[PDB]
Symmetry: C3
Subunit: 100 residues, 3 copies
């Protein structure tokens, strides 16, 4: 292939998220890096799907609920930031307190 470091980081995220979601479908509450991976992949998928920055923000609040992660993970995650390519280019997407 010919992956930039940024592109590879993006794939890692997709791979960590699939691993995470498999664990979620087995009934395991997610840890902090697993949650970050799931939420980050959600931003990447959104931008890939043509979603706007705002629709990605809007939707991301509903991806993991407090009950889906281990105790303490929500206060470990006041902010996630992910760069994704939207229709006008590369943008840093901010998810504030995504998990409640």
């Amino acid at each position: 292939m010919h992956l930039t470091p940024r592109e590879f980081d993006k794939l890692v995220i997709h791979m960590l998220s699939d691993v995470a979601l498999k664990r979620k479908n087995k009934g395991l509450k997610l840890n902090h890096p697993e949650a970050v991976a799931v939420l980050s992949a959600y931003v990447l998928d959104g931008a890939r799907e043509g979603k706007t920055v705002e629709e990605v923000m809007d939707g991301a609040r509903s991806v993991l609920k407090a009950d889906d992660v281990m105790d303490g993970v929500p206060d470990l995650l006041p902010l996630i930031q992910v760069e994704a390519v939207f229709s006008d280019g590369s943008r840093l997407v901010s998810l504030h307190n995504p998990i409640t």
Copy 2:
């Protein structure tokens, strides 16, 4: 588990392929590097399954049609070349104009 650089590259092709096929599954037209991953993983899988070079070449032509990829992708893709191990060792597989 020690992977050689070439083996790691093969893993990266399979994982990029998997991400691209998930997108196709959702009805999204594939971009250029996505199409390259899917066709490249096809060759690797073909070789792994004991198909001949010629069988993989024949098979690869129907993997992705023009409607499966974004406008412009077919003429962005006159040639894909993928090294894979066949029953007589490493071979450089050339896919000519695979997306029509």
Copy 3:
């Protein structure tokens, strides 16, 4: 990811690839078998199994019929570092494929 963390991701991704091949009815090769059994150790530890339950379950993950001829004797030992409840542990699988 730390190098060790990245190694574990690589193990999961090689195992997924090996399992898809198993589902196609292909006999696994040696490194495919290693990835499957290693990912199994990693999964059991993450699920909260003890080292002993992981060892006990591991012997039944791949049978001789699931792997190419010669693979069992190429595999007298797998060792996998995994994080259990009291920290990092080196799990040994002795003769896992019979």
